[PDB]
Amino acid sequence: AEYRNWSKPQCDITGFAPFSKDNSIRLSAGGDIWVTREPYVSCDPDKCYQFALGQGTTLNNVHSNNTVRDRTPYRTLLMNELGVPFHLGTKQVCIAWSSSSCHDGKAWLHVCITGDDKNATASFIYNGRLVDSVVSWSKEILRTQESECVCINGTCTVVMTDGSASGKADTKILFIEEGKIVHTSTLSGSAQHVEECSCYPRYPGVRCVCRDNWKGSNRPIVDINIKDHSIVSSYVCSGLVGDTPRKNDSSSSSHCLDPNNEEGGHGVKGWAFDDGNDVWMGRTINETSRLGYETFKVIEGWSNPKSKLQINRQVIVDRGNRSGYSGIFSVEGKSCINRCFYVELIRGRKEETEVLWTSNSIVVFCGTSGTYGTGSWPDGADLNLMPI
Amino acid sequence: AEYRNWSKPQCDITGFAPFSKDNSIRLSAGGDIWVTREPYVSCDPDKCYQFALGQGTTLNNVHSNNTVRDRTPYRTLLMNELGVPFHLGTKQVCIAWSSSSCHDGKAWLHVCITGDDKNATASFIYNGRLVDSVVSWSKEILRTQESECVCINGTCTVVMTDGSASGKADTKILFIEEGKIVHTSTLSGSAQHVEECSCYPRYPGVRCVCRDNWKGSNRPIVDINIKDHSIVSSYVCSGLVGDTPRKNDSSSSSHCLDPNNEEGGHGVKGWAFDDGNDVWMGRTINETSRLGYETFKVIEGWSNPKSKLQINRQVIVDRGNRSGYSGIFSVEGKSCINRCFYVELIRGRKEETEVLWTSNSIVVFCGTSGTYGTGSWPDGADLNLMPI
Amino acid sequence: AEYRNWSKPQCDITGFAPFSKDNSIRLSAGGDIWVTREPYVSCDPDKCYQFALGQGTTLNNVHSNNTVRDRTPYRTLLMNELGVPFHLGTKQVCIAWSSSSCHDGKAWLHVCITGDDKNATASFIYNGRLVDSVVSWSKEILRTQESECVCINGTCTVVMTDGSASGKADTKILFIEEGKIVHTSTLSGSAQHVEECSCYPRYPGVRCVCRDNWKGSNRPIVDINIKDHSIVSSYVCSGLVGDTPRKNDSSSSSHCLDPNNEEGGHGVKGWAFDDGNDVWMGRTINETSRLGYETFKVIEGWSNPKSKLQINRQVIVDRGNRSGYSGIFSVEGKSCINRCFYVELIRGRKEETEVLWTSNSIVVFCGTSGTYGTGSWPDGADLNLMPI
Amino acid sequence: AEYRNWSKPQCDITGFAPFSKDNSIRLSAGGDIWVTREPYVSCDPDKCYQFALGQGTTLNNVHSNNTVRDRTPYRTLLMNELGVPFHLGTKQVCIAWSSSSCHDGKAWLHVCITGDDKNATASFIYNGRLVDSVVSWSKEILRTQESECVCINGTCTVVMTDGSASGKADTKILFIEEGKIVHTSTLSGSAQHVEECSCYPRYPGVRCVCRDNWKGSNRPIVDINIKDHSIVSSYVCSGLVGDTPRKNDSSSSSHCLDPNNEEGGHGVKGWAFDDGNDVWMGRTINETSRLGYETFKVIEGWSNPKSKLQINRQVIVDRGNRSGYSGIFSVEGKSCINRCFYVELIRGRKEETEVLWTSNSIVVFCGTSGTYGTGSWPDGADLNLMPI
Ligand SMILES: *[C@@H]1O[C@H](CO)[C@@H](O[C@@H]2O[C@H](CO)[C@@H](O[C@@H]3O[C@H](CO[C@H]4O[C@H](CO)[C@@H](O)[C@H](O)[C@@H]4O)[C@@H](O)[C@H](O[C@H]4O[C@H](CO)[C@@H](O)[C@H](O)[C@@H]4O)[C@@H]3O)[C@H](O)[C@H]2NC(C)=O)[C@H](O)[C@H]1NC(C)=O
Ligand SMILES: *[C@@H]1O[C@H](CO)[C@@H](O[C@@H]2O[C@H](CO)[C@@H](O[C@@H]3O[C@H](CO[C@H]4O[C@H](CO)[C@@H](O)[C@H](O)[C@@H]4O)[C@@H](O)[C@H](O[C@H]4O[C@H](CO)[C@@H](O)[C@H](O)[C@@H]4O)[C@@H]3O)[C@H](O)[C@H]2NC(C)=O)[C@H](O)[C@H]1NC(C)=O
Ligand SMILES: *[C@@H]1O[C@H](CO)[C@@H](O[C@@H]2O[C@H](CO)[C@@H](O[C@@H]3O[C@H](CO[C@H]4O[C@H](CO)[C@@H](O)[C@H](O)[C@@H]4O)[C@@H](O)[C@H](O[C@H]4O[C@H](CO)[C@@H](O)[C@H](O)[C@@H]4O)[C@@H]3O)[C@H](O)[C@H]2NC(C)=O)[C@H](O)[C@H]1NC(C)=O
Ligand SMILES: *[C@@H]1O[C@H](CO)[C@@H](O[C@@H]2O[C@H](CO)[C@@H](O[C@@H]3O[C@H](CO[C@H]4O[C@H](CO)[C@@H](O)[C@H](O)[C@@H]4O)[C@@H](O)[C@H](O[C@H]4O[C@H](CO)[C@@H](O)[C@H](O)[C@@H]4O)[C@@H]3O)[C@H](O)[C@H]2NC(C)=O)[C@H](O)[C@H]1NC(C)=O
Ligand SMILES: *[C@@H]1O[C@H](CO)[C@@H](O[C@@H]2O[C@H](CO)[C@@H](O)[C@H](O)[C@H]2NC(C)=O)[C@H](O)[C@H]1NC(C)=O
Ligand SMILES: *[C@@H]1O[C@H](CO)[C@@H](O[C@@H]2O[C@H](CO)[C@@H](O)[C@H](O)[C@H]2NC(C)=O)[C@H](O)[C@H]1NC(C)=O
Ligand SMILES: *[C@@H]1O[C@H](CO)[C@@H](O[C@@H]2O[C@H](CO)[C@@H](O)[C@H](O)[C@H]2NC(C)=O)[C@H](O)[C@H]1NC(C)=O
Ligand SMILES: *[C@@H]1O[C@H](CO)[C@@H](O[C@@H]2O[C@H](CO)[C@@H](O)[C@H](O)[C@H]2NC(C)=O)[C@H](O)[C@H]1NC(C)=O
Ligand SMILES: CCC(CC)O[C@@H]1C=C(C(=O)O)C[C@H](N)[C@H]1NC(C)=O
Ligand SMILES: CCC(CC)O[C@@H]1C=C(C(=O)O)C[C@H](N)[C@H]1NC(C)=O
Ligand SMILES: CCC(CC)O[C@@H]1C=C(C(=O)O)C[C@H](N)[C@H]1NC(C)=O
Ligand SMILES: CCC(CC)O[C@@H]1C=C(C(=O)O)C[C@H](N)[C@H]1NC(C)=O
Ligand SMILES: *[C@@H]1O[C@H](CO)[C@@H](O)[C@H](O)[C@H]1NC(C)=O
Ligand SMILES: *[C@@H]1O[C@H](CO)[C@@H](O)[C@H](O)[C@H]1NC(C)=O
Ligand SMILES: *[C@@H]1O[C@H](CO)[C@@H](O)[C@H](O)[C@H]1NC(C)=O
Ligand SMILES: *[C@@H]1O[C@H](CO)[C@@H](O)[C@H](O)[C@H]1NC(C)=O
Ligand SMILES: [Ca+2]
Ligand SMILES: [Ca+2]
Ligand SMILES: [Ca+2]
Ligand SMILES: [Ca+2]
C-alpha cells in the first residue's frame, strides 16, 4: 500500500449520476436503525464508506426523544460501507459530536470532537489507535468539517473552528501525519467566517468550500498548501450563491473576496468545485429553508462575481421535500479524480412535529462524463405512520 | 486476478440439483427482512451472491403498503452472499428500479437504472466506483435484464430496452470495459420485442434468451459477438414455449424466426440454453399465471420449431404454488461451465389479497451431470397468519 | 493451502474441557433466532463453525408451530462461526433436511439432502459450487450423518443410508474429490443397521461410530479405507453401551460383532473413539429418554465386550435437563489431533408441551490433556415464560 | 506475523483522550443487545476489540431477570471489534463466568473459567482451538483478571486466584505458550490479597495492579518476570488510594509493602501504571460506592507512600453517575507503547431498583501526549423509561 497523492487530473464532468441511497428512516419504521445527523461519505482506495454522528440511540427507542440537540456525551461517529444502513452491528469508531475522516492510502484517520462546549477535546485516531489530541483553543465549541478530510503524500489536512457562530471565530488548519499533528496554520486571507468545510484534493494542494455563518450567503473558499503549510482564503464568486438562507436569484449578489452581507446570518453545510473558470455547485432549492436540493454549473462562476449563467441544472430532491447538509467527496479513477456529493435528508423536529425525534437518511450522487436524465430522490418516510 | 473468458465447454447436464433457498417471506413474519422483487444470482470467481430490487422498506413496516408498484425513488439493488436473507445489514449497492450485475474476474459491475419514467438514468458502477452513465434514449422506461450480465476478456455486455412494452421498442446492447461504455450496438435480426434477457457466456460470444412482451409466447434469442460487436436475433424454436401467458401444449406452436402470435401480449422473465440441437428450458407450469415452475429438455428443441419431445421434466415449484421471474446464471467448474437458475417466488398483491404488500423469496437450482429425484420447494409462508 | 491428511497421532486425552455454548433458545426469547435441530460442528484449518438444519423460520414467528417435523422443503443447512448464534444474517449454505460438512484443507464440502421422502436428492457442494448429486437408491428417506464428514489427502468420505429405520436398510459410503463422487462402496461387515455416523480421521483411514436404530443399543463402528475404498464394520465392545434407549448398567450387555438385542429399537445420534484398547464415549444419562449427558472412559472398552470399568466420568448436562444428539469433530494441533464433541440441547415438542415449537441450543467440549473439574451446562431457557 | 515483545519505551502521557463508547444500555431500549458485566478491551496488532461476560440473554428478554448473579452456566465471553455493541451477531468465544484475553502477535489467547464454584475449570484457547485446561486448586471460585493478559516473545502470562475473597487466598501466575501452560509460579512477596489484576507489558517483564479484597484499600502490585518465572509483589505507595471502598483524601494513608487496613474489605477492579516515580491511576470518585470515575497523576506516587500530590485530574464519569470496574490495556505505537483504560458503566440491580436486570456499557480513554479539555461520559440510559 502506498500513500494517496491524487496527482491525476479532475474528471470531465457533465453533471451527476445516482450512486447510493440508504432509506434509513423508512427502514427505521420496521427495524433497529440509529438516529443520526451530520452524515458524510469517504472512501478507501477500494470502496466507499458512509459516516454519520449517532445520537447513541435507535429510532424506535425511548432515547430518541429530543435528539434535536447537537452535543451530548452519547454521540459517536458511525461507520459502515456505503449503502449499508446504520443497523445495530454498526461500528462506532470514536466518541464525537463533530468529526472528519479520511484515508491516506494506508489507513483511516478520524478526527473526533467531544466533551464540554467550553472545553472540548479533539481526538486523532489513525490505524485503529489514538495518536494525538488537542484542547479547544478559544473555549467555544471546537468543531470541524462533518465531511471527509484530505491526505496527500501521507499528510492529511483538516479545518477546525473554535469561537462564535455569529461573530469572529478562530479557525485553524491542522496537518496530520499518521495521526500526529505535525503543524497548525491559522486561518488567513479574506474569508471572514468559516465553518463545516467541504474539502477536496486539488494537486498539489487541497481546496475547501465552507459555510459563512455570519454575514455571507456566498460560500468561503479555503486554499491549503500541503508542503509549506500556507493558507489563503476568499469566496465563491458566482452570483448564484450556495448558502441557505440567501436572497432570490434576481436579487442575490456575491463578491470574490468579502461576505455579500445578504441574509448572511446562519447557513447550511455545502459544497462547490472549480472547472476551469466555471463552478459546479449544489444548494437547497428553497432560499430560506432546507427544502429541495439542486446542482448546476455556473459558467464563469469561479472568476466572475457578476456571472449568473447556470447550465446543466439537476433536481436531486424536489422542492417540496426536506434536504439538509451536503458535502463533497473525491474518488480516484484510472486516469482522473471524480467528484461526488452526498445530501443529508433530515426528518423530524423542529421542522416536522409529527414525531419527537430528529434523524436523517442520505442520497449520494457522483460526477459523470456520460449522460443522465431526471428525477427526485427524497427521504420517503411517512412521519404520520411512524413509531408513535 | 485475471479476467474471466469462460473458454471452457459447457458441462454435461442431465437435469438440475437443489442449490439454495432463502425462505425470505417465512423469516419476515418474525424478523426484519426487506421487501423485494426482481431477484437474481451472480457469482464472483469464488462464490455466489443473491441480488434483488428492494422497495426501500422491510416487510413488517408501514412502508410495505403498496409495494406492488415497479418504480419508486426508494428502490435499491440489494446484494448478499447466496443464502443470506436480505436482513438489515444488507448492502444496497446502488439506486435502481431496474438492474443487472456481473463480475469480470477482477471486479463487480452493476448497471442500475432509476429516475423519472420518461427520462431515467442508467448508472455504471465498477469496482466500487461510478464510471459512466447514459440517459434514456426513447424516453419510455429505460430498463435492463434483472439478471446477471456477462463479461468475456474484460468486456462486459448488457441488454437494455427503452420504449413500448406492447409495441415496437428500442433495444440496445452495451459493451462495457471497467464500467466504461466502449460501444453500443442496436438490436438487429428477427426478434421483434425483447426484454429482461437471460444471458450466458457461450465462448467466444454471449447468448441471451429474452421475453417477448408483445406478440410472442415463444422466447426471443439474442446473440452477442463480443469482439466485433455484431448482433443477431431470432426465437426459441421448440414447440413447447417458455413464456407465460401461452397456449396449452396441444395447441401451442412456435417459429425459429418470428413471434408465434399466441397470447403474445405480456410475458414473464425466463430462460433457456442450447445443448447441441436440444434446448433446456424452465417455465411456469400454469399456462396463464405465475403458478408452479418446471424445467425440461425438449429434444431437437433448439433447431426444430415443430419438435415437442420433452424428456427429463422436473417440478421445481408445484402447480398450486406461486412462482414468478426466473433467470440463468453461469458458474465455472474445473473443466466446464455450469448452468444454474433461480426462481422468484412472489407473494402478496395483486394476486394474494390477505396482505397489503408484494414481496418474494427465492429458490436456486444448478446443472448436474449426476442424478436426482423429485420434490417441490415453494415459498411456504402462510399469508393468513402474517403481519396483519 | 494444502489438503489435510491428519497424519499426526491422536492427543492424550484425560477428559474434556468446555469449549463453546450458544444459548440459542435463551436468546430467542428476546431476539430473532432460527429454529433448528440436528446441529453439529466442523472446522477449517483456522477456526470452527457451527452448523444446524433450520426449519426455515425464526422462533418468535408464526411459522415455528409444528417444527417437530423432520423433512419440509423449507429446511436449510445453517452455518456460522462457532459461538455466533443463528441470527438473521446467518448463511443458509444449501437446501437440506439431512446433511454433512467437512473441509479438506482447501475448501468446504457440503452434502445436502432434500426433496420427496420416496425420491430425495443429495447435492454435493464444494468451494461455493454444485459439483454432483445422486438420487435416492432405495426410495426411502435417503439420509446422512448430521455431523462432519472426513477428508484425507483431498478424498472426503461420507456415510449415507436409504431404506428402513427399523429393518434392513441400504447404507453406502461415498468418496468425494472436489465435490465429485469418485466412488461408492456399499456397507459390509457385521454392522446390521447403521445411521447418523460420527466419523473421525484415524490415519490412514476414517473411523465412524453410528446409531443402530433396529436391534442394537450398542453402537455400530464403520471402518473406511480411503485408498482402496474397502469397508469393514462391527460394534463398540464396551458393556456400558452408548445408544438411548438402552438397559441399565447392571442389566446391559454388548457384543463386538452383533447388535445386543436390548431395547434396540430406536436410538439417538452419538459418538465414541478408541484410545489404545479403551473407549472414550458420551451418552445420555437417562437410559430411556434424551435427558442428561455424560462422558467417560471404559477401560478395555474397545476390545472387551464384558468390560464395564468406567473411569473419568464427567456430567456435561445434568440428568434433569434435556439433551439430544451429540457427535464428534476433530481439530488438528501442533503435534496431535484432538477430539471434541457437541451436544444438541433439544427444547419444545413433543416432550415439552408449554410451547408449539421444537428447537435446540448447543454446548461444545474438547479433549484435554490437562485437568478439569465439574459442572452442568444445560439449555437454561424457561419455556413457561417464552413466546406464548 | 511475529510475536509481540513490546520492546519499546512507554509513551509520554500528559493525561487521557476519549477513544470509544458503545451506549450499550441506551441501544438496548430499542434493540437486541446482550446483558453483560466485567467488560474489557484488548487489541490485536491492527485493531481493538471489546470483550465482556454475557449473561446468556439479551436485555429485552425474560431471561434478564436476576442477572445480578455472578456465575451461571449460561455466561460466555463476548467479543466484538471496539465500538460494535454486543448485538445478536456477536461471537461468544468460550464459556466463562471469569476470563482474560490477549494476542501474542500471531493469535488470540482466551482464558475462560466456568463450572461449579467448588470445582471450576479454566480452559485455554489459542488460535481457535482448545490447547489446555486446569482444575481449581483450592476449590473456591477459581477466577482470573477480567481484563487483558500480556504476551512477550510468545509467552503469555495471566494471574489467577482460588480461595477466599475475605481471607488468605491462593493466587498463581501462569505462563502460556501457544495455549499450553508451560509453567505455574505461585504468588510471592508482600501482597496479601490479590484479585482481578490489570496487567501491562513493562519490558522485559509484565506489571499488574490488582484489587485487595481483604484488608487493603491501597492496590497490590504484582511483578512478573517472563524469562525466569520469578514473582515479586507489594502495593501502590501513593497516599491517594485507588480501591473502593476507601477513606477520604484527608484521612487515607497507604504503605509500599502492606495493606493499609482502611475499609479494606471489598474493592472494585482497577488500574495504575508507573511514570518514573510518579503514578497514573484511575478510581471511582465516590469513596464508598461505584459512583463517578476520575483519573490523575500523583507526583512521587509510585515511590512515596506519604505523597498525596495529584496533578492533571480528569473527570471521566461525573460523581452523580454510576461507574464500575475499570482496567488497563496497552497499544503499540510507531515508537512507544500507549496506555489506555476502559470503564464499566454498571446499570440496574441491586443499586438501581427500577428494573430487574443488571447490565453495563463501556467508555474507553487512551493515553495522550497532546492536550485535552473536560467533560463527562456516563451511561445515559433512562431506567425509568426502559423495558418495564
Ligand atoms: C432529461 O434530462 C436531461 C438531463 O437532466 C434534461 O436536460 C437538461 O435540462 C435542464 C433543464 O432545462 C437544462 O438546464 C438548464 O439550462 C438552461 C440553459 O439555457 C439554454 O442555453 C444553452 C446554451 O449553451 C442551450 O444549450 C440550451 O438549449 C438552453 O436552452 C438554463 O437557463 C436553466 O436554468 C434556468 O432554468 C431553471 C429551471 O429549468 C431555473 O430554476 C433556473 O433558475 C434558470 O432560470 C437550466 O440550467 C440542462 O442543461 C439540460 N442538461 C443536459 C445535459 O442536456 C432534459 O430536460 C430531460 N428531458 C425531459 C423530457 O425531461
Ligand atoms: C425420481 O425422480 C426422477 C428424476 O426426477 C424421476 O425420473 C424422471 O421422471 C420424469 C417424469 O415422468 C421423466 O420425464 C418425462 O419423460 C417422458 C419421456 O417419455 C419416455 O421416453 C423415453 C425415451 O427416451 C424413455 O426413456 C422413458 O422411459 C419415457 O417413458 C416425457 O413424456 C414426459 O413428459 C410428459 O409427462 C409430463 C408429466 O410427467 C407432462 O407434464 C408432459 O407435458 C408430457 O406429457 C417427461 O418429460 C424423466 O425423464 C425422468 N428422469 C430421469 C433422469 O430419469 C422418477 O420418476 C422419480 N421416481 C419416483 C418414484 O417418483
Ligand atoms: C472435581 O472434578 C474432578 C474431575 O471431574 C472430579 O474427579 C473425578 O471424579 C469422578 C466421579 O467420582 C471420577 O469418575 C469415577 O471413577 C470411578 C473409578 O473408581 C476408582 O478407581 C480408580 C482406580 O484407577 C481410582 O483412581 C479412583 O480413586 C476411584 O476411586 C468410577 O467407579 C466412577 O463410575 C461410577 O460412579 C459414577 C458416579 O460417580 C456412576 O454413575 C457410575 O455408573 C459408576 O458406578 C466414575 O467414573 C473421575 O475419575 C475423577 N476424575 C479425575 C480426572 O480425577 C472430582 O471428583 C471433583 N471434585 C469435587 C470435590 O467435586
Ligand atoms: C480545560 O480542561 C483542562 C484539562 O482537563 C483543565 O486543566 C486541568 O484542570 C485540572 C482541574 O483543576 C487540573 O488538575 C488539578 O491540579 C492541581 C494542581 O495544583 C496546582 O499546581 C501546579 C504546580 O505544578 C500548577 O501548575 C497549577 O496551576 C495548579 O494550580 C491539583 O491540586 C488538583 O487536585 C485538587 O483539585 C481537585 C478538584 O479540582 C480535587 O478533587 C483534588 O482532590 C485536589 O484537591 C487537580 O489535580 C489539571 O492539572 C489541569 N490540567 C492541565 C493539563 O492543564 C482546565 O481546567 C479546563 N478549563 C476549563 C475552563 O474548564
Ligand atoms: C420528551 O422530552 C421532553 C423534553 O424534556 C419532555 O418534556 C419535558 O418534561 C419535563 C419533565 O417531565 C416537563 O416538566 C417539561 O414540561 C418538559 N420540558 C420542556 C422543555 O418541554 C417530554 O416529557 C418527553 N416526552 C416523552 C413522551 O417522553
Ligand atoms: C394503503 O395504501 C392505500 C393506497 O394508497 C390506501 O388507500 C388509499 O388512501 C387514500 C388516502 O387516505 C384514500 O382516499 C383512497 O381511497 C385510497 N386510494 C386507493 C387508490 O385505493 C390505504 O389507506 C393504505 N392502507 C393502510 C392500512 O395504510
Ligand atoms: C398449530 O398447528 C396445528 C397443527 O396443524 C394446528 O392444529 C390443527 O389445525 C387444523 C386446521 O385449523 C385443525 O382442524 C386440527 O384440529 C389441527 N390438526 C391437528 C393434527 O392437530 C393449530 O391450529 C396451530 N395452532 C396455532 C396457534 O397456529
Ligand atoms: C424474577 O425473579 C425473582 C427471583 O427469583 C422472582 O421472585 C421469586 O419467585 C419465586 C417463585 O415464583 C417466589 O416464590 C419468591 O418469592 C421469589 N424469590 C425471591 C428470592 O425473591 C420473580 O418472580 C421474578 N419476576 C418476574 C417478573 O419474572
Ligand atoms: C456550533 C455552530 C454550528 C453552526 C455553524 O452548529 C452546527 C449547526 C447545525 C445546523 O445549522 O444544522 C447543526 C450542527 N450539528 C451544529 N454543530 C454543532 C456542533 O452544534
Ligand atoms: C416496463 C415494462 C416491463 C414489462 C416487460 O415491466 C416489468 C413487468 C413486470 C412483470 O411483468 O412482472 C414487473 C417488473 N418490475 C416490471 N419492470 C418495470 C421497470 O416496470
Ligand atoms: C428417517 C430415520 C431417522 C432415524 C434414524 O430419522 C431421524 C430421527 C430423529 C430422532 O430420532 O430424533 C430426528 C431426525 N431428524 C430424523 N431424521 C430424518 C431425516 O427424519
Ligand atoms: C469471587 C470473589 C470476587 C470478588 C473479588 O467476585 C467478583 C466481585 C464482583 C464485584 O465486586 O462486583 C463481581 C464479579 N463478577 C465477581 N466475580 C465472580 C466470579 O463472582
Ligand atoms: C420555503 O420554505 C417554507 C417552509 O415552511 C415554506 O413555507 C415556503 O413556502 C417555501 N418558499 C418557497 C418560495 O418555496
Ligand atoms: C391457473 O391459474 C389460475 C389462477 O387463479 C387458476 O384459477 C386456474 O385454475 C389455473 N389453471 C390451471 C389449468 O391450472
Ligand atoms: C427418565 O426420563 C423420564 C422422562 O419423563 C422420567 O419420567 C424418568 O423418571 C427418568 N428415569 C430415570 C431413571 O431418571
Ligand atoms: C456516595 O454514594 C452513596 C450512594 O447512595 C450516596 O448516598 C452518598 O451521598 C455518596 N457520597 C458522597 C460523599 O458523594
Ligand atoms: Ca451564511
Ligand atoms: Ca409474450
Ligand atoms: Ca438402537
Ligand atoms: Ca479493598
Short mmCIF file of C-alpha atoms in Angstrom, two decimals, chain C residues 250-357:
data_model
loop_
_atom_site.label_atom_id
_atom_site.label_comp_id
_atom_site.label_asym_id
_atom_site.label_seq_id
_atom_site.Cartn_x
_atom_site.Cartn_y
_atom_site.Cartn_z
CA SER C 250 -26.35 -53.73 35.85
CA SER C 251 -28.51 -55.39 33.12
CA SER C 252 -26.88 -54.14 29.89
CA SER C 253 -24.57 -56.28 27.77
CA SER C 254 -22.85 -55.86 24.40
CA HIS C 255 -21.02 -57.84 21.67
CA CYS C 256 -18.08 -56.84 19.45
CA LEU C 257 -19.79 -58.10 16.23
CA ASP C 258 -23.63 -58.16 16.57
CA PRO C 259 -26.44 -55.92 17.85
CA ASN C 260 -27.07 -56.71 21.51
CA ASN C 261 -30.86 -57.05 21.08
CA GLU C 262 -31.56 -54.91 24.14
CA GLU C 263 -34.18 -52.19 23.68
CA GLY C 264 -32.54 -51.96 20.24
CA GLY C 265 -35.49 -50.21 18.60
CA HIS C 266 -34.86 -46.50 18.09
CA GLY C 267 -31.71 -44.68 19.18
CA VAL C 268 -30.06 -41.29 19.36
CA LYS C 269 -27.11 -39.99 17.36
CA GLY C 270 -23.87 -40.29 19.33
CA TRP C 271 -20.18 -40.92 19.30
CA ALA C 272 -17.17 -42.87 20.60
CA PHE C 273 -13.44 -43.10 19.87
CA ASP C 274 -10.60 -45.56 20.59
CA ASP C 275 -7.69 -44.89 22.93
CA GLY C 276 -5.46 -47.96 22.76
CA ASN C 277 -7.91 -50.68 23.84
CA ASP C 278 -10.01 -48.27 25.86
CA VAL C 279 -13.00 -46.34 24.58
CA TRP C 280 -13.98 -42.73 25.20
CA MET C 281 -17.74 -42.30 24.82
CA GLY C 282 -20.55 -39.90 25.54
CA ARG C 283 -24.20 -40.80 26.15
CA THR C 284 -27.47 -39.56 27.67
CA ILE C 285 -27.63 -40.13 31.40
CA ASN C 286 -31.33 -41.27 31.46
CA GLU C 287 -31.45 -44.77 29.89
CA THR C 288 -34.73 -44.34 28.00
CA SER C 289 -35.05 -40.62 27.13
CA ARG C 290 -32.83 -37.75 25.95
CA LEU C 291 -32.22 -36.42 29.45
CA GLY C 292 -28.80 -35.51 30.81
CA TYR C 293 -25.47 -36.21 29.12
CA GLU C 294 -22.30 -37.84 30.39
CA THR C 295 -18.92 -38.85 29.10
CA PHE C 296 -16.49 -41.43 30.48
CA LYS C 297 -13.66 -43.81 29.65
CA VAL C 298 -14.37 -47.54 29.74
CA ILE C 299 -11.09 -49.35 30.35
CA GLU C 300 -10.63 -52.21 27.86
CA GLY C 301 -13.95 -50.90 26.43
CA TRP C 302 -12.81 -51.12 22.83
CA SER C 303 -11.68 -54.78 22.86
CA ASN C 304 -13.61 -56.42 25.69
CA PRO C 305 -17.41 -56.74 25.39
CA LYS C 306 -17.64 -57.88 29.04
CA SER C 307 -15.73 -54.80 30.32
CA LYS C 308 -17.73 -52.26 32.31
CA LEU C 309 -14.87 -50.47 34.05
CA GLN C 310 -15.54 -46.75 33.64
CA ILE C 311 -13.21 -44.06 34.95
CA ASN C 312 -13.04 -40.26 34.41
CA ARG C 313 -16.83 -39.71 34.28
CA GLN C 314 -17.99 -36.16 33.54
CA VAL C 315 -21.50 -34.77 33.70
CA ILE C 316 -21.97 -32.44 30.72
CA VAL C 317 -25.73 -31.83 31.20
CA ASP C 318 -27.30 -32.91 34.45
CA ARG C 319 -29.88 -35.74 34.47
CA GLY C 320 -32.87 -33.38 34.98
CA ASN C 321 -32.07 -31.36 31.85
CA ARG C 322 -32.77 -32.24 28.22
CA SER C 323 -30.01 -33.31 25.87
CA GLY C 324 -30.28 -34.80 22.38
CA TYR C 325 -27.97 -35.63 19.50
CA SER C 326 -24.25 -35.50 20.01
CA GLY C 327 -21.33 -36.11 17.66
CA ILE C 328 -17.55 -35.92 17.25
CA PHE C 329 -15.40 -33.43 15.46
CA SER C 330 -11.59 -33.46 15.09
CA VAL C 331 -9.26 -30.47 15.47
CA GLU C 332 -5.58 -30.51 14.45
CA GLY C 333 -2.98 -29.32 16.97
CA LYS C 334 0.73 -28.61 16.54
CA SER C 335 1.68 -32.24 17.21
CA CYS C 336 -1.61 -34.16 17.56
CA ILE C 337 -5.27 -34.46 16.51
CA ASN C 338 -7.78 -33.57 19.23
CA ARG C 339 -11.29 -34.96 19.67
CA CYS C 340 -14.13 -32.66 20.59
CA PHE C 341 -17.85 -33.20 20.77
CA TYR C 342 -21.02 -31.11 20.62
CA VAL C 343 -24.36 -31.87 22.27
CA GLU C 344 -27.72 -30.83 20.91
CA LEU C 345 -29.87 -29.42 23.76
CA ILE C 346 -33.42 -30.01 22.46
CA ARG C 347 -36.35 -27.91 23.77
CA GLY C 348 -40.09 -27.93 22.95
CA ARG C 349 -42.44 -30.55 21.46
CA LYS C 350 -43.30 -33.37 21.72
CA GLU C 351 -41.68 -33.79 25.13
CA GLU C 352 -42.22 -30.20 26.37
CA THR C 353 -45.80 -29.00 25.81
CA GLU C 354 -45.54 -25.37 27.11
CA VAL C 355 -44.80 -24.16 23.54
CA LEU C 356 -45.70 -25.20 19.99
CA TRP C 357 -42.15 -25.30 18.63
#
